[PDB]
Design a protein around this ligand. Structure first.
Ligand SMILES: [Cl-]
Ligand SMILES: [Cl-]
Length: 220
């Protein structure tokens, strides 16, 4: 990572989502709720959040499988909307089921290398960060929203350090949301700016937070 090649991580985990309910009659219903594709540039912190509205599933079967294909279609659509100089050189899919759908959808983009990964990058943790969760839940149509997942960090730290910090945050939220949120609020006065994702912390506070997040992930 981090060279002069544009790299995107693509996480399709959260595209097809449902609420499972046991009815008074004893049967399970699985009603879809809105999902999202996360498309993430680890060098710049750019996130393209493509919100997937439940209308896309209307009249369809095997929604989990179809979701992989929907994701590939949407990644291709995003690429086509961008100038060539902004298109990724590499796409790293977080789940192996995306490899074949994305290959088939990107045949017109011979410069783009697609590969899988064993990295633990749980963008699903973002669903419990209110500023994404409510946005996704309340959407009434598909849309794409841009974010900067590194806030103002790159003013003083490298892309490598920023990526590592983000991964620790996401993995810790994933493992234990409530404890991660406490670690990320070290003082009564700790705030997150309205346009930021993460809290405003001193350098010293971040050092302590990063060790605590890592320990939380290790405890599993
Ligand atoms: Cl998969
Ligand atoms: Cl969109």
């Amino acid at each position: 990572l981090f060279s002069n090649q544009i790299i995107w991580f693509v996480d399709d985990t959260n595209v097809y989502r449902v609420t499972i309910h046991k009815t008074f009659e004893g049967n399970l219903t699985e009603k879809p709720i809105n999902g999202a594709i996360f498309i993430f540039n680890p060098r710049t912190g750019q996130l393209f959040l493509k919100i997937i509205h439940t209308s896309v599933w209307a009249g369809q079967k095997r929604l989990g499988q179809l979701a992989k294909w929907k994701t590939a279609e949407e990644v291709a659509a995003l690429i086509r909307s961008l100038p060539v100089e902004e298109q990724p050189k590499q796409i790293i899919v977080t789940r192996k089921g995306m490899l074949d759908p994305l290959e088939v959808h990107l045949l017109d983009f011979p410069n783009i290398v697609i590969k899988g990964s064993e990295l633990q990058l749980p963008f699903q943790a973002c669903l419990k960060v209110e500023k994404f969760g409510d946005l996704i839940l309340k959407a009434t149509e598909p849309q794409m929203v841009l974010f900067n997942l590194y806030d103002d960090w790159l003013k003083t730290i490298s892309s490598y350090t920023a990526f590592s910090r983000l991964i620790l945050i996401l993995r810790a939220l994933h493992v234990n949301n409530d404890r991660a949120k406490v670690i990320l609020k070290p003082d009564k006065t700790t705030i997150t700016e309205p346009h930021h994702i993460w809290p405003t912390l001193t350098d010293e506070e971040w050092i302590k937070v990063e060790v605590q997040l890592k320990d939380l992930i290790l405890a599993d």
